[PDB]
Amino acid sequence: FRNNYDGDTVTFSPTGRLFQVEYALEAIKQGSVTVGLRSNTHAVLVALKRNADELSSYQKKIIKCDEHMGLSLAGLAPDARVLSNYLRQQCNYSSLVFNRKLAVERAGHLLCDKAQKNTQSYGGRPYGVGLLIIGYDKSGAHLLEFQPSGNVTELYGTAIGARSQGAKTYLERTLDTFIKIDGNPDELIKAGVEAISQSLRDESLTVDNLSIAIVGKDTPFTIYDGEAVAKYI
Amino acid sequence: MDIILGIRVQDSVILASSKAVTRGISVLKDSDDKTRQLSPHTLMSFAGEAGDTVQFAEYIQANIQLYSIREDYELSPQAVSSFVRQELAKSIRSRRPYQVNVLIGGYDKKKNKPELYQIDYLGTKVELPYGAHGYSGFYTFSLLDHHYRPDMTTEEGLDLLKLCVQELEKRMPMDFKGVIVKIVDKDGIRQVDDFQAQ
Amino acid sequence: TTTLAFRFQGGIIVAVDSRATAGNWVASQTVKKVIEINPFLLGTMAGGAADCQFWETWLGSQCRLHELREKERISVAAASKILSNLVYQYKGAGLSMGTMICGYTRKEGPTIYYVDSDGTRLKGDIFCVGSGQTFAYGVLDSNYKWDLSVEDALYLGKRSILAAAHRDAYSGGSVNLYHVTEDGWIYHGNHDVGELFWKVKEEEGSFNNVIG
Amino acid sequence: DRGVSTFSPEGRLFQVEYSLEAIKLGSTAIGIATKEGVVLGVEKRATSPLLESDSIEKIVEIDRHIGCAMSGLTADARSMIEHARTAAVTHNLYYDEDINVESLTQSVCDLALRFGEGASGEERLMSRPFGVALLIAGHDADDGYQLFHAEPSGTFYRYNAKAIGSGSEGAQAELLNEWHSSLTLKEAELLVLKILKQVMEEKLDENNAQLSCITKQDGFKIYDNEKTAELIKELKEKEAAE
Amino acid sequence: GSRRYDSRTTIFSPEGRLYQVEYALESISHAGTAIGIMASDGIVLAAERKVTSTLLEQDTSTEKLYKLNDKIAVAVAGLTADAEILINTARIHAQNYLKTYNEDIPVEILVRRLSDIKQGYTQHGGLRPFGVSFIYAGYDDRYGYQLYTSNPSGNYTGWKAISVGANTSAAQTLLQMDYKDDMKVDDAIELALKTLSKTTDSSALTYDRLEFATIRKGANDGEVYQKIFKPQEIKDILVKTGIT
Amino acid sequence: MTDRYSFSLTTFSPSGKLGQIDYALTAVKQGVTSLGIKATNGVVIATEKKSSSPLAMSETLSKVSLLTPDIGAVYSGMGPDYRVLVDKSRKVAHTSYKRIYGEYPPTKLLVSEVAKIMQEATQSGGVRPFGVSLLIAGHDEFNGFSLYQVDPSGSYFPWKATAIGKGSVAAKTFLEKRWNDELELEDAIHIALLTLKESVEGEFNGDTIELAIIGDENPDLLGYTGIPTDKGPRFRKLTSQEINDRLEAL
Amino acid sequence: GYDRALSIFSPDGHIFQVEYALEAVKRGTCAVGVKGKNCVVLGCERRSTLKLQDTRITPSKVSKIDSHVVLSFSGLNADSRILIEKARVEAQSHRLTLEDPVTVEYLTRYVAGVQQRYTQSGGVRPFGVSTLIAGFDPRDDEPKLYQTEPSGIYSSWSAQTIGRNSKTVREFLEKNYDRKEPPATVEECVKLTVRSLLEVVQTGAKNIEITVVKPDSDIVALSSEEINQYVTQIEQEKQEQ
Amino acid sequence: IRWELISRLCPNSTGAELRSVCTEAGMFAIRARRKVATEKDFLKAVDKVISGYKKFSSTSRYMQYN
Amino acid sequence: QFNPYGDNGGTILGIAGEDFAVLAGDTRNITDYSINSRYEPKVFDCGDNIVMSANGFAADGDALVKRFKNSVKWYHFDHNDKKLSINSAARNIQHLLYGKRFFPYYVHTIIAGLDEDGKGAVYSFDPVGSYEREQCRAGGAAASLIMPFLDNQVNFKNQYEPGTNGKVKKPLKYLSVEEVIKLVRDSFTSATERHIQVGDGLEILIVTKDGVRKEFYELKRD
């Protein structure tokens, strides 16, 4: 249960941790699985959407902020709007002032700098949203893992969500495999689909449950949904 | 610029206003009326540059009605004149001045005697039995310094107004297209459509 | 430019030319100088093209908001007055504008209001603004009649705009007519002056000074 | 009390956790999505027979093509409805076209996450999240007839058939098997009346429930009392068939 | 977090009344008593200053009666410090009314302005409400003499006779029996003096701790004369009332 | 960021009395015992300088200050609070009168104006009341000599003779017999010296007594000659040598 | 300045401040209003704890917002006249902006909106008043009676009462008033309103104030010498039957 | 009797309050001398208990502690 | 003082067909009296088969193009990548052109595209911020040489059937892409020698159902 030191975000535990941030990270854990991975020349996101009931819909867990970038969701939906809007503002500012497409690492730095100022000052709350930024710049394909704590790191692949982290082992066993795969988007997407399948517990993958995005040089950022994703099922 | 006139007799006060609206080179409407009924026992007649006239008149009407409905008691015409002269005084030094030459007259319940005041566009408060603004004054002060009396009635004051209006229409190149006569007394507000020959 | 509107027992008729001039050279002939705010009331073009066009399009927002808020159609008086106030708070900034707010109501019947960049709001029956408004004001008043039928009113307006555009340099082009009824305005059609002047001169015999 | 925008050990924010269950204290609003349109119905719940049926309006029209129902505490949605109407009309003014229903719902649900103290970086003020859930319904030229659910948590769903409020669990269960993609508008109205009757407190008439409809040609329309009465009679005929 | 130290001044109690104004209405009872009697010929305002000693200055000393306008005077019952700001704002508002209309401000307008000032703090801002209640007296051509009262809650009602402060109930009960509708100024003055004698906590009634403000209208019409009774004239009415 | 303490820190207790006001009164009643009495031809305000450490300089510390060349101030509460109060009061007095009217305000209006600051402090949120009690003495050409005592609540009372501090009760209960209607400046200063004699607990000399007098307009301290309109400042303060001359006059 | 939120969603879903304002209203003076075919009557009582309150300068319980629409309140009297001031200034602004006298529906919507905003804005407690709005729309003779709650919910009532013991007056109106057959005369409406009041006021003919609103800008306030006149035959018809 | 309707018209009430509702519904029939409590009795009892005795409710403060 | 405005030369022209639309403009940009550069395209693809060219201040035109592209991107983002209609783009530009009144953009821009019915539409925008539906019109100081020529072979104005003595108007016909491109090429080849800032090649853009095709034609470099 909540303790005395919960209060507001500006408060240190005697052990030396922020309970607000920890609660944000737990809410990150509670969300659905959105495993993603990248190759030398391609970046693939795989998302498992959730429906309230049979007569319901699915959340767009894949948000596009530019043609050379993309986003994934692992938590609170409304704050994802704010985060995506900020990322789009900075991408458009880069386009209009520098002409340079925003570097993926620079995007992660901006996102962490934004996420800080709620946890640093009174009146703010941490962004309980987990971004898996993908993109491709002149350097190469990149992938990040954003956290409400402000921690941002670049990885070949990861999975944030309910029992999603149980699907990291599939990536780790095949980490040496999908890295050396270049210019082969369909099979990389197939490997990603195999990765998420390990995180299934009750219901299998269907047409309306799989949302897939992929970016690259020859392949711009494209979101797959509906019948367009059944070929990879 | 248009013709606005006002004459106060010992019994009531009569307000006269031109019906012409001269914009550009054509006449948009010759049957217009420039009057505002701030209170059932007070009349408001305005003139000056048309950009500021109607909205300013509505502003003062709004404030007067708000006071009258908040207190359920009628302000004296002197109080209304002070109010409007404050608006002019605070407005002329602003970024966008209000250049409206205005006439305020009405009946007073406390002293049981009607009053009439003249406010220029600069915000000067004067107490006169009669007055005019712009180019219509020259032919009204000269004529009303001869036949006007302190003890006349409204009916022959109407005849004096006919003489004044005849002088205006004879010596003005600008045609006011007639005038609308409205009397202000203890009874209320009444409109008189006879201006040419009475 | 010459825009005119009048009132009679049947409805409201407006007749506006379609000639837009860029100084000496006529910029365009296919412009539409009537802004269809909604199928109840009207709007006209006079002076600044963008200045009138934007705010008259901006009017439709306020009409929709008032209709959704009061569950009833916005009166013509309020529609004219909101634009009057908005122009008033923008005076001295270089805005030059002129328009006719023509609407038809149940309780107040047909109503025509005048609004300019000066901020003056007027209520009347005969209104005409533009570059050649004077060339029109000499026609309708002579032939004005409260019981004119729809066809007679349309022909009177068409002849008035023809006469105004014949003499005024910046007035001309196609002629648009609009009839306002309980439903609202109904588009009558486009009327090019080429088939109008010759038919009038041959049929009625006016403009005798013109050769041919 | 302690904290306003504070999180919880379970990881869901407060207030919105309370607001998500405060809707059940309100009325019952039910909508059904059909290819021929969407049928909405509410529960007036006159606290006394001295109330007026035409007084309390729990169904509003954001636009000719988009309308919504109401549930929970009604007062907070007035800000929601004003903002939604302003957004729709401003989008029409800016883009000379109707605003897409999903976009309008998105532009509405963002306001549900503005509670906070001393907002920094921009001037935005709100004490508590709105405690009202809305059923956005309308038609568009790309997808067709839509029925959304403007939750106070900032999330929204497209819904084929939904009940919110008191009957959010009772009526919703019946909608699972009573809905099909071949449902017609007439049968949709009959089913809505039947489900309301099942969830009714008192006898159902034109004074106790108010219905509406959205269509591609007729647009939004509030059903009159006479048609509601004949719908009640038709439902009465239908229920006792065998 | 700047929360634990907040007292939540503007908070509704479980049963449903405010709590800070509730204790302000107790703070009022601990201040010096004041009395206001509405007579046909005028209005008499009297108050008994609290904490009196031989070293208290009486030559030029008015702490309970204050002048806001040549026609309108007020009586203060409560914390004088908080009453000072209200007095200054009332004077500013009255002078602004004379600026705007060039006519004497009616008592009701000023009473509303002060009530609104109190209510604004009782509503928002999270600040403690003013712990002062006023007694308003004035004249005009609208309703003749007027005698209102104020409260920390910001509500005002008209009264033919009021007494706010210590032993309010006793003073009200004493005055209600002797109050008629036809006294002159002197009868109201002697009634107020008797009430103060019978409600005071001391033994005798010395002129040092009594203050008097009267409104009179004589030969001059339309303008009343406002006189704050100085001690030299204060000791005079004591023998007239028989207390001496 | 700003100030998050926008709420009032003074809250009405259920007993009907202000907490912080009745707490500042307690903080005032303990401390330096000061006093001031008013005579016919002048007003004398006296206080004792409790030298905290004998290595310090009581000369640098000004227990009494000059609000205006006519009006002086004596306190009995907390040092820094009185210093900030006196600086603010001088500033606002200048702003209100020297800028607008052209001369120095009289005692009556200056006291109300300075008490405005304290009565705002007990009202404005996020701040605590001043812990000082001010003794204001001054003279004017119309109301004459006057002495005012300002309490931390903001209430000010006109008093002919007063004392605030640890020995307030004894000095107050001893000043009634000392004081009468007619008095002289030297008589008043002797009265003040006799009263302060028992209330001091340390060494008694000219250095440990801070004494100021408001009397006739002395032109020597004026700082210029040639204007008959003004004749000098009425507020003068005795040095140690000046006071250790009447000290043995007891 | 003050940004702290005062209205917080309780764990059971209600807002504690709003539901406390409900009780704050429940302690106010009883105010009742009924409408006939062309007449609406707003009846109200006054506090009888203290006497020697004059009538001329005593603020009327029913405050005139405009010439055609009037308002009556119950509960905390301090906060209600602020709503009265806001409604009056908003009505004047509406006259300026739309060139149309205000309607009862629009004014009631505005009052509900301002109460809702105060329940929404931070650092401000909700109003402790409940208001009754009555009047006639321009060029329309239909009386409209509206009730506005501190929670922000407004509704039309053929006959509604607020304040202390409002349950008794409500049940009385539930049987001696017919919604489908309203009283046809001003006298009948006044008689019903008066007889409703004696069910709670139980003497106090001096401090019973009644305002009768009529179309075509006609608002009157019946004096004591008429209210006691009605009371005479009302009490005469009570005990003998 | 319609137990579903009675359950619905009693939101966020702990089981002890439901037991008290049952007891009061039984009581109201006794006061009217009826030997059988009907739905109209249960509605009155639930209104009185849940709504009338709402200010003295415990499940709204202690929920925060949990 | 300082002149915040200026001239750069150049001309644009857009013609609306039946199922298509064409936008053409010169690649020459000049300052004061001399040629600045030879190959300066002024027609840009705005996406969704929508094109627009800005004639007037180079800085103002470039800023308008960039901000309109940003607005198009935002509309795609927030409306779930909904297709942008030409009318919506025109009204959005009108709002952009009315962005500030004290410092209006002194640029004449013309857009082109297809409606929801597949019919060619062209809109000309006034620097004050006004626009109207239109078939064909040129822009810049060279419009006077070009626009009256269009009425000859597009509107067929003041032209009557031979043998009818002028009492019969010619029935209108719909031109193919080749017809309009040759008309515009002749128009610009006639304008280049008669107007000093016209030349240095021609860029003409064709909008069709398939997409946008770019064609360039060299003109007189004098």
* C residues 115..154 contacting B (CB < 8 A): 116, 118-122, 124, 126-127, 133-134, 137
Q: How was this structure determined?
A: cryo-EM
The one catalytic residue among C1, C3, C99, C111:
C1
Interface C–G counts its CB contacts (< 8 A) at: 20
What sections of chain G are H helices per DSSP?
16-26, 77-98, 104-120, 166-176, 186-201, 224-239
Domains contained in chain C, CATH given: 1-212 (3.60.20.10)
C-beta atoms surrounding I211 within 10 Å: 9
Kindly give, in sequence order, each residue whose CB lies less than 8 Å from that of residue G108, ignoring residues fewer than 6 positions away: G133, G146, G148, G154
Give the Cα separation of I132 and G149 in Å (integer): 51
Chain-centre distance of CA G28, in angstroms? 12
First to last CA, chain A: 41
- Is D106 near chain I, with CB under 8 Å? yes
Neighbours of chain B (3+ CB pairs under 8 A): C, E, G
Give the Cα separation of G193 and G214 in Å (integer): 16
Cβ atoms B135, B174 nearer than 8 A = yes
* G residues 61..100 contacting B (CB < 8 A): 64-67, 85, 88-89, 92-93, 95-96
DSSP for F74-86? Answer: EE-S-HHHHHHHH
Kindly give, in sequence order, each residue whose CB lies less than 8 Å from that of residue D143, ignoring residues fewer than 6 positions away: D101, D102
CA geometry: angle at F15 spanning F13 and F21, to 5°? 50
A224 chain-I contacts, CB cut-off 8 A? none
Cβ atoms C80, C92 nearer than 8 A = no
Please name the residue of chain G whose CA is at the shortest distance from the CA of residue C83.
Answer: G97
CA nearest neighbour of F209 among F30, F45, F37, F39: F45
E1-244, CATH topology level: Glutamine Phosphoribosylpyrophosphate, subunit 1, domain 1 (3.60.20)
C53 chain-I contacts, CB cut-off 8 A? 94, 129-131
- Dihedral, CA atoms, I95, I97, I101, I104, nearest 10 degrees? 180
Secondary structure string (H, E, C) spanning chain E: CCCCCCCCCCCECCCCCECHHHHHHHHHHCCCCEEEEECCCCEEEEEECCCCCCCECCCCCCCCEEECCCCCEEEEEECHHHHHHHHHHHHHHHHHHHHHHCCCCCHHHHHHHHHHHHHHHHHECCCCCCCEEEEEEECCCCCCCEEEECCCCCCCEECCEECCCCCHHHHHHHHHHHCCCCCCHHHHHHHHHHHHHHHCCCCCCCHHHEEEEEEECCCCCCCCEEEEECHHHHHHHHHHCCCC
CATH of residue A161? 3.60.20.10
Q: Residue type for G81, please?
A: R
Please name the residue of chain F whose CA is at the shortest distance from the CA of residue D118.
Answer: F1
Burial B7-17 (b: 16+ CB within 10 A, else e): bbbebbbbbbb
Question: Which residue in this structure is represented by tokens 């914390």?
Answer: E79
CA nearest neighbour of E10 among G6, G130, D2: G6
| Type and span of the H or E element at F188 | helix F185-199
Q: Do the Cβ atoms of E85 and F9 come within 8 Å?
A: no
Count of alpha carbons within 13 Å of H34, Cβ hemisphere only? Answer: 12
- Is E222 near chain B, with CB under 8 Å? no
E61 chain-F contacts, CB cut-off 8 A? 157-158
CATH of residue B18? 3.60.20.10
Cβ atoms A158, A35 nearer than 8 A = yes
Q: Do the Cβ atoms of I98 and C54 come within 8 Å?
A: yes
Q: Do the Cβ atoms of G24 and E160 come within 8 Å?
A: no
Q: Do the two chains F and H touch, given a threshold of 8 Å on CB pairs and at least 3 pairs?
A: no
Output DSSP code: residue A143: E
| Type and span of the H or E element at C104 | strand C97-104
C1 as an active site residue: the answer is yes
Secondary structure string (H, E, C) spanning chain D: CCCCCCCCCCCCCCCHHHHHHHHHHCCCEEEEEECCEEEEECCCCCCCCCECCCCCCCCEECCCCEEEECCCCCCCHHHHHHHHHHHHHHHHHHHCCCCCHHHHHHHHHHHHHCCECCCCCCCCCECCCCCCCEEEEEECCCCCEEEECECCCCCCCECCEEEECHHHCHHHHHHHHHCCCCCCHHHHHHHHHHHHHHHCCCCCCCCCCCEEEECCCCCCEECCHHHHHHHHHHHHHHHCCC
Give the Cα separation of F239 and G7 in Å (integer): 62
Q: Do the Cβ atoms of D24 and H64 come within 8 Å?
A: no
Please give the structure tokens belonging to residue G230: 């009605």
Give the Cα separation of C174 and C164 in Å (integer): 13
Query: What's the resolution in A?
Result: 3.6
F5 chain-D contacts, CB cut-off 8 A? none
Interface E–F counts its CB contacts (< 8 A) at: 100
CA nearest neighbour of A72 among A187, A213, A229: A213
Which among G5, G152, G177 has the least Cβ separation from residue D4? G5
Cα dist from D128 to C152, D80, D114, D152, G116, whole Å = 64, 14, 8, 11, 12
| Gap from C2 CA to chain B (nearest CA, Å) | 13
C75 chain-G contacts, CB cut-off 8 A? 98-100
Question: Domain locations in chain E?
Answer: 1-244
Say how many domains are in chain A: 1
| Gap from G120 CA to chain F (nearest CA, Å) | 19
Kindly give, in sequence order, each residue whose CB lies less than 8 Å from that of residue E23, ignoring residues fewer than 6 positions away: F12, F13, F14, F15, F16
| Type and span of the H or E element at B7 | strand B4-8
Give the Cα separation of D90 and C58 in Å (integer): 9
Cβ atoms E175, E37 nearer than 8 A = yes
Question: Domain locations in chain D?
Answer: 1-242
H64 chain-D contacts, CB cut-off 8 A? 1
First to last CA, chain I: 33
Output DSSP code: residue A103: P
Kindly give, in sequence order, each residue whose CB lies less than 8 Å from that of residue G9, ignoring residues fewer than 6 positions away: D14, D15, D18, D19, D22, D128, D129, D131, G15
| Type and span of the H or E element at C28 | strand C25-28
Q: Do the Cβ atoms of F154 and E24 come within 8 Å?
A: no
B72 chain-G contacts, CB cut-off 8 A? 64
E100 chain-B contacts, CB cut-off 8 A? 82-83, 86
Please give the structure tokens belonging to residue D3: 């904290």
Domain enclosing residue A162, as ranges: 3-233
Output DSSP code: residue G31: E
For domain D1-242, which CATH number applies: 3.40.50.10470, 3.90.1170.50, 3.60.20.10, 3.30.300.30?
A: 3.60.20.10
Domains contained in chain I, CATH given: 1-222 (3.60.20.10)
- Is D215 near chain A, with CB under 8 Å? no
Cβ atoms D119, D50 nearer than 8 A = no
Which among H5, H11, H64 has the least Cβ separation from residue D24? H11
> β-pairing, D29-34 with D161-164?
antiparallel
Give the Cα separation of I50 and C132 in Å (integer): 39
> β-pairing, E225-229 with G143-148?
unpaired
Longest pairwise C-alpha distance within chain H: 44
Give the Cα separation of B33 and B179 in Å (integer): 8
Interface mutation vs chain B, best among C118, C120, C129, C131, most B CBs within 10 Å: C120
Please give the structure tokens belonging to residue C199: 């038919």
Give the Cα separation of E115 and E108 in Å (integer): 10
Q: Do the two chains I and A touch, given a threshold of 8 Å on CB pairs and at least 3 pairs?
A: yes
C27 is in an annotated binding site: no
Interface mutation vs chain F, best among E11, E13, E55, most F CBs within 10 Å: E55
Q: Is B3 exposed, middle or buried (0-12, 13-18, 19+ CB in 10 A)?
A: buried
Interface mutation vs chain G, best among B36, B56, B69, B71, most G CBs within 10 Å: B69
Q: Do the Cβ atoms of B55 and C120 come within 8 Å?
A: no
Cβ atoms I65, I89 nearer than 8 A = no
- Is G4 near chain F, with CB under 8 Å? yes
Chain-centre distance of CA A197, in angstroms? 17
Domain enclosing residue B140, as ranges: 1-195
For F110, the 3-state DSSP assignment is helix
Cα dist from B56 to B48, B78, C101, whole Å = 11, 19, 22
Domains contained in chain F, CATH given: 1-249 (3.60.20.10)
Domains contained in chain G, CATH given: 1-240 (3.60.20.10)
- Is E172 near chain G, with CB under 8 Å? yes
Q: Do the two chains C and B touch, given a threshold of 8 Å on CB pairs and at least 3 pairs?
A: yes
Give the Cα separation of I103 and I60 in Å (integer): 11
For I63, the 3-state DSSP assignment is helix
